[PDB]
């Protein structure tokens, strides 16, 4: 039975599921993002005050790995949580029609910023579009850091490179990746707060995008 299928879908992803996410985002999530920001800034200070020798090419700093893993874990949760909100909207997009789409427009509007959050802000995709990647650092931050660093580690270790700038670059990779987390976290906060607002102002139409009073017809 077709109505029953639709009904099962909608019963299992209700407005409470999406509200649950928004409540968490307003409380726990923005706090965690804040903490990651402070972890990252603190690590950036440590590195700024360091002089790097060949010793630094022989160990991967665990402070930086920790900050990066912590950010990847947050981005992971926000993505899974975003997809709950998307499911709640997408499964209520009504029958396609050339009119009575004022609510449908609200639905596509909010789905669009949640897509921008996942694709663009979280950098979740395998390959970014011709829009580029506007976020300072993506989901796969740890991987980006370890690739950038290992290339420079190789050249330094080997007879190692005698490039004075290559040594300073190893340090700059450490510095910049903590900077990128500070920046990325602010950016993510703005976006999360924007979606909190967009959802709470629009939720009624997100769930019921049409109501048609046939008082006029008998």
Partner 1 sequence: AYDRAITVFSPDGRLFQVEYAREAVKKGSTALGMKFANGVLLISDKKVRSRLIEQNSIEKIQLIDDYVAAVTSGLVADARVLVDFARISAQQEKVTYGSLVNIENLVKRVADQMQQYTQYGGVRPYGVSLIFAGIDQIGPRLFDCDPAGTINEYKATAIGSGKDAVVSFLEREYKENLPEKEAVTLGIKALKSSLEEGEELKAPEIASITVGNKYRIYDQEEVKKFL
Binding to partner 1 in span 97-156, by CB under 8 A = 97-100, 102
CA 25 – CA 32 distance, rounded (Å)? 10
CB neighbour class for 200 (10 Å; exposed up to 12, middle 13-18, buried from 19): exposed
What is the distance between the alpha carbons of residues 166 and 200, in angstroms, rounded to a whole number?
50
> What mask, x for binding partner 1 by CB under 8 A, covers residues 51 to 90?
----------------------------------------
| Cβ atoms of 44 and 175 closer than 8 Å | yes
- For 127, 157, 172, the CA distances from 130, given in Å and listed in that order, are 10, 37, 28
Q: Given candidates 4, 126, 127, 217, which one binds partner 1 under the rule CB under 8 A?
A: 217
Among 20, 46, 166, 207, binds a second copy (CB under 8 A): 166
Could you say whether residue 207 binds a second copy (CB under 8 A)?
Answer: no
Q: If binding is defined by CB under 8 A, does position 14 make contact with a second copy?
A: no
Q: Please state the closest distance from residue 94 (CB atom) to partner 1, in A.
A: 12
Contacted entry of partner 1, a second copy, none for residue 1, CB cut-off 5 to 8 Å set by kind? none
The DSSP code for 130 is T
170/175 Cα distance (integer angstroms)? 9
Nearer to a second copy, 46 or 166 (CB): 166
- Closer to partner 1 at the Cβ: 162 or 213? 213
**Total residues contacting partner 1 (rule CB under 8 A)?**
12
Contact, 209 vs 90, CB < 8 A? no
Residue 125 lies near a second copy (rule: CB under 8 A): yes
Q: What residue ranges bind partner 1 (CB under 8 A)?
A: 97-100, 102, 212-218
């Amino acid at each position: 039975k077709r109505a029953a299928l639709i009904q099962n879908l909608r019963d299992s992803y209700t407005e409470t599921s999406s509200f649950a996410v928004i409540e968490e985002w307003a409380a726990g999530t923005l706090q965690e993002i804040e903490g990651i920001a402070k972890a990252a800034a603190e690590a950036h200070g440590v590195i700024r005050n360091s002089t790097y020798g060949r010793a630094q090419a022989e160990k991967s700093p665990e402070q930086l790995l920790g900050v990066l893993q912590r950010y990847q874990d947050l981005c992971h949760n926000v993505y899974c949580q975003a997809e709950t909100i998307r499911t709640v909207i997408a499964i209520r997009i009504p029958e396609h029609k050339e009119a009575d789409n004022l609510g449908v427009a609200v639905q596509h509007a909010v789905l669009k910023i949640i897509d921008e959050l996942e694709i663009k802000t979280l950098g979740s995709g395998e390959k970014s579009g011709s829009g580029g990647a506007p976020t300072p650092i993506g989901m796969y931050a740890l991987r980006e850091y370890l690739s950038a660093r290992s290339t420079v580690e190789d050249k330094l270790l080997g007879g190692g490179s005698q490039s004075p700038s290559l040594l300073l670059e190893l340090r700059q990779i450490d510095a910049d990746f903590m900077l990128k987390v500070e920046l990325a976290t602010t950016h993510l906060s703005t976006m999360v707060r924007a979606v909190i607002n967009a959802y709470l102002l629009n939720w009624k139409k997100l769930i019921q995008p049409r109501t048609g009073t046939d008082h006029m017809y008998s």
